[PDB]
Amino acid sequence: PTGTNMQLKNVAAVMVTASYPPFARQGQTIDVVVSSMGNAKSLRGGTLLMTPLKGVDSQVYALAQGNILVGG
Amino acid sequence: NYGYQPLFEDRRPRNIGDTLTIVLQENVSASKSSSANASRDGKTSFGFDTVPRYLQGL
Lengths: 72, 58
What we know:
The structure is cut from a larger assembly and holds chains A (72 residues) and B (58 residues). Chain A has 72 residues and is mostly beta strands. Helices cover 0% and strands 36% of the residues of chain A. Chain A has a two-stranded antiparallel sheet with strand order 1-2. Chain B is 0% helix and 0% strand. It is classed as motor protein.
């Protein structure tokens, strides 16, 4: 339901950036960079859910999901 | 297929067929007035109640 307040401590909104390689085929894997937006504290031991990756043409090209590695 | 769309730039109409919101906020007021006036009045009077003898012919 709407209206009810929700206070969360384990969720952080992030932006995901990636580099599309030349001559790319479907099924291949690329590395991504995950950067926190808002006022989160740290991303230590986090897990990224499904994320569409779009270019400047507003069309999808890759789906991202995995575990974030922080040096600490 | 769509062209290049910026991320941070505001939603602006850029081609034929895009939409825009117009807020009709018109308020025009004007007036004018003028007037003029003129007046003139005059009155003269002279009398002679008792005329003496030496002025009686005049």
